Design a protein around this nucleic acid. Structure first.
Ligand SMILES: CCN1C[C@H](C)n2c(c(O)c3c(=O)n(Cc4ccc(F)c(Cl)c4)nc(C(=O)NC)c32)C1=O
Ligand SMILES: CCN1C[C@H](C)n2c(c(O)c3c(=O)n(Cc4ccc(F)c(Cl)c4)nc(C(=O)NC)c32)C1=O
Ligand SMILES: [Mg+2]
Ligand SMILES: [Mg+2]
Ligand SMILES: [Mg+2]
Ligand SMILES: [Mg+2]
Ligand SMILES: [N+]
Ligand SMILES: [N+]
Ligand SMILES: [Zn+2]
Ligand SMILES: [Zn+2]
Lengths: 184, 368, 368, 184
DNA sequence: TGCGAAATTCCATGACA
DNA sequence: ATTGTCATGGAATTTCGCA
DNA sequence: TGCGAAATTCCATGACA
DNA sequence: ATTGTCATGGAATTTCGCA
């Protein structure tokens, strides 16, 4: 069996609803399987259309052999199937209620949910602008399993923004009480 | 003046006036019998006014000015007095064309890594498409990988939006651009400083300096053209296809696509190369680092026979950038302060400001 | 197709397929073990569709198209099939740029007499002066003597008025001009026929053909510029002064002024030449006829290493004159009917009309 | 004494009033002494101003050493003197009531008066357009005294409009009775 | 029949949209 | 059925002035 | 160790206003 | 305080296939 490579598999997924930000409510999450590299796209809905619009931007840069998702409606639609077929992309679904990825992807996906939550408190409404810096952080984050960041695995070089400051990623007692104020 | 010409009339010898010719007086004027015929020798005190009159008939150069003078007069070393005037005619100096070529172009080292240097620039206006009129073109120096963003204007604000989307992927050390208003605004400078990006600017009105991105324009427009043949010019929807098509096109001299130089492996696109299927990612990235260092690099071409190259303290003139109708194509003379490299200089302009300028937009002021 | 590939699998030899390589079957496809790795050999019936797919990714030329194909396939003489497609891609042929230079310019004989040939042309629009916007420039082929007429428009009617004033002095055999609307109108043709003047036209969009008059523009504007420095552009009052100044300026290569070549003697202008004071008019006119025949004549320059020259029946393409944004710069292919001279041809266009065209506005269609 | 040359002397003179033609009433007549070459300029008045305007067109082509005229007001004005001095042109006047030129010039000047009169009958009003063809005729007219036309003396070549048809220049009986009708 | 310097000729460069 | 041209100003070469 | 032809490399040309 | 570049497609040169 040939070794895993970038572009072999993109794991795609939606996160939201979120507090409105410049009229956007969701984030399409794309993670490369082999490298753990992550693309984020803001959308207004988890629809086949917003998904196609978004992946059209991504696929003008790199095309995956396989997209893997859960059985969300956007991904199981027959439109989305046509889109994928047009591009020679094989679609892959995880069984209902039993989402499988890889350890790397599950961990990455966790870091995203955690990293977002940390910065959306005190400014639940200004995440749209933060997306670029979120991704930079995520992609310049050191991997325990391999010696290298996703940036290094994708491009074969050091980045010019090394996030040498590993962060708490935990909520401080200030932020915990402030987040329980927003829900109210 | 009148002193010199007296000694001469009475057979004595004066330096410059060859003794084998007969110098006489006639009609109250000192004359001489030259092979070409008989010419007047004006007194030194007159000679400048004569040259100036001759030159001003049509503001002629050396020989054509000489030929008028030689019709009536002779004196020693006429051309020296002609050249002296040409060097002092402000109108001639700021109007005439240079007849010296620039020295041979530099071929700067290819940046060493993806994301070391970005070359950017606008194309447009294009025909309206979806309400868009311009394209932001971004070219990574090392890979040639290209990003295309449609805009409504070649503005800072649209440049910022676009670069925020791109810098999501990686931040570059340097962004090189020409001096278009969009890139020189302080709003843009702040945006760069904020992200630790250093801005590098081309010498003004010298797009060869942005050659890396400039050259990509031609391919972009060329592909847009072929695709839009026989249809109306709905280009907006094509930018993504064009970007992808180009980034995965082979450069015959390099034998790699820009995508390959960026990633070390083809994505799922037609005719993807499969040569590294059996290597690990790590083995692949190792062979990539190798490819990246052994890419062809062109060398400086031979100088043309009549090139000039700048020297500190030399009088030179800057080309007028957008000359109005019937107005000089050249600024007043200025002085070379530093020679940054054989094709780039800093000049003190007479105002006097410091300006960093391409040798191509200079001529060496004539007649010293 | 499928026939050929069977014989091949069972060890037999087919022409083109070198026998020292192992040809097998795998995944239902004929493969081969080449130095570069293992490639598929598609059946002949498939090969065209493959090339077309490869070429269409970005409409690439020979090698870049080959490099995509070679990633997945091998078959004998791939480039021949690549080149075949490039010659049939209408989009590429009308869009790409030529990479062959024109053959070396002709240096046509200087007309033999004043008034043999007139070269004419407009300059403008200029800034308004006295309500005037253009200049009619008339240059006698033999002498370079120049007449300048201000006009409100580059119109036939203003051309006629001006030429009636000039033809008062003498009528010329030929008037050569470009194909500007003013000169191609039937009103103009009638005006010429009436006076026994033959009209000669430059090949379209090729001002070198009107080079004699074109070159005079530069001197005219250059002198207008020097004179108007620091003042507003009131040029109308200067035309007479400019005309006179130029007509009496020496050409250093010729050693004569255009006035001298026209009249054989200076008029009462500054620095007038007095060399023929003692000759009779008749003696003077004799020496003039002599000067006129022994004027310097430049010869054709050497061809550049990659020039092309037209052959009857060859496929060539005309340059689009004023190409719109994102539209091809070249017309569809046409055929060379006659080769008028090595730099001029008549082509049949596909419509098909006969057109006389400069070699500079042609490229030889690529890939035959 | 050095031989006579073109541009040595221009003989200038006015002819008119004439019947109005495109609002013009006079003709300034310029004849080169040595060659007999003739320039004609239509004017609205025999004033120093119309004269200066006209000779400005001529003198942008060729400048005479000497202008010779009779003592017409236009030529004796001090404006006209300034104009001439600016250009290094020496002015020359014939004594009052005793106009001297040269044989060549007197004869030429006669041909003009005669040639004009011939064509201004039957169309006394369309002379403005005829001026170009008048001059061509006059300058391509064979000289008895020298072997050559003025064109040939000025340029040292044959002309492309040889007026090989020497004309009557006399009024026919038709034109004589028609001219005596116009005066009426 | 030869020197140093002035004069003349050579000719690449650029610009006529 | 038509077609480059020529001012410019340093460099190269020739000629001049004198011996 | 040398042939004819295919493959590859060379590189002038032109175009990014 | 900065700096030309590179697709194209015939021609030149090298390598291939075979002996
Ligand atoms: C206002 C800021 N600004 C300054 C000038 C206007 N500029 C800018 C451009 O992007 C370009 C450009 O692309 N090209 C085309 C071109 C021409 C010859 C070449 F070699 C290459 Cl490499 C490119 N030309 C010019 C120009 O300088 N014309 C005179 C230009 C620019 O943005
Ligand atoms: C409409 C009829 N028409 C056709 C074209 C428009 N044209 C006409 C002109 O007078 C000129 C002109 O002077 N130049 C300047 C130029 C450029 C390069 C040269 F070598 C030379 Cl000797 C002169 N260019 C063009 C032109 O063809 N531009 C693309 C031109 C003309 O009248
Ligand atoms: Mg720009
Ligand atoms: Mg540009
Ligand atoms: Mg024209
Ligand atoms: Mg023109
Ligand atoms: N460099
Ligand atoms: N010719
Ligand atoms: Zn001047
Ligand atoms: Zn094509």
């Amino acid at each position: 069996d040939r070794p895993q490579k970038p572009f072999d598999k993109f794991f795609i997924d939606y996160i939201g609803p979120l507090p409105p930000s410049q009229g956007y409510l969701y984030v399409l999450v794309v993670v490369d399987g082999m490298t753990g590299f992550t693309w984020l796209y803001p959308t207004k809905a988890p629809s086949t259309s917003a998904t196609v619009k978004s992946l059209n931007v991504l696929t003008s840069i790199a095309i995956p052999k396989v997209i893997h998702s859960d059985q969300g409606a956007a991904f199981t639609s027959s439109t989305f199937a046509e889109w994928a077929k047009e591009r020679g992309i094989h679609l892959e679904f995880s069984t209902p209620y039993h989402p499988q990825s890889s350890g790397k992807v599950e961990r990455k996906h966790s870091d995203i949910k955690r990293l977002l939550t940390k910065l959306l408190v005190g400014r639940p409404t200004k995440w749209y602008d933060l997306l670029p810096v979120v991704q930079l952080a995520l992609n310049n984050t050191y991997s325990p399993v391999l010696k290298y960041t996703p940036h290094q695995l994708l491009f074969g070089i050091d980045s010019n923004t090394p996030f040498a400051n590993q962060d708490t990623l935990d909520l401080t007692r200030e932020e915990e009480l402030s987040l329980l104020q927003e829900i109210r | 003046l009148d002193a010199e010409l007296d000694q001469l009339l009475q057979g004595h010898y004066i330096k410059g006036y060859p003794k084998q010719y007969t110098y006489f007086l006639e009609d109250g004027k000192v004359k001489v019998s030259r092979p070409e015929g008989v010419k007047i020798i004006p007194p030194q005190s007159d000679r400048q006014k004569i040259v100036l009159q001759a030159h001003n008939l049509a503001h002629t150069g050396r020989e054509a000015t000489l030929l008028k003078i030689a019709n009536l007069y002779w004196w020693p070393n006429m051309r020296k007095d002609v050249v002296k005037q040409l060097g002092r005619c402000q109108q001639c100096l700021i109007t005439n064309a240079s007849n010296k070529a620039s020295g041979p172009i530099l071929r700067p080292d290819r940046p060493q890594k993806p994301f070391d240097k970005f070359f950017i620039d606008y194309i447009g206006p294009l025909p309206p498409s979806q309400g868009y009129l311009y394209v932001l073109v971004v070219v990574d120096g090392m890979t040639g990988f290209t990003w295309l963003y449609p805009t409504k204007a070649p503005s800072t604000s649209a440049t910022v939006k676009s670069l925020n989307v791109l810098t999501s992927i990686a931040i570059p050390k340097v962004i090189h651009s020409d001096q278009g208003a969009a890139f020189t605004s302080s709003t843009f400078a702040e945006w760069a400083k904020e992200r630790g990006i250093h801005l590098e600017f081309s010498t003004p009105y010298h797009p060869q300096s942005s050659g890396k991105v400039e050259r990509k324009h031609s391919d972009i427009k060329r592909l847009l053209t072929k695709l839009l043949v026989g249809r109306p010019t709905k280009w907006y929807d094509l930018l993504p296809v064009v970007q992808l098509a180009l980034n995965n096109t082979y450069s015959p001299v390099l034998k790699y696509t820009p995508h390959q130089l960026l990633f070390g492996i083809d994505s799922n696109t037609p005719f993807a190369n499969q040569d590294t299927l059996d290597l690990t990612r790590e083995e692949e990235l190792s062979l990539l680092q190798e490819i990246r260092t052994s890419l062809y690099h062109p060398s400086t071409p031979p100088a043309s026979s009549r090139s000039w190259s700048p020297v500190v303290g030399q009088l030179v003139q800057e080309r007028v950038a957008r000359p109005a109708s019937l107005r000089p194509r050249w600024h007043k003379p200025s002085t070379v302060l530093k020679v940054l490299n054989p094709r780039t200089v800093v000049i003190l302009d007479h105002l006097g400001n410091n300006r960093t300028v391409s040798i191509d937009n200079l001529k060496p002021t004539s007649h010293q």
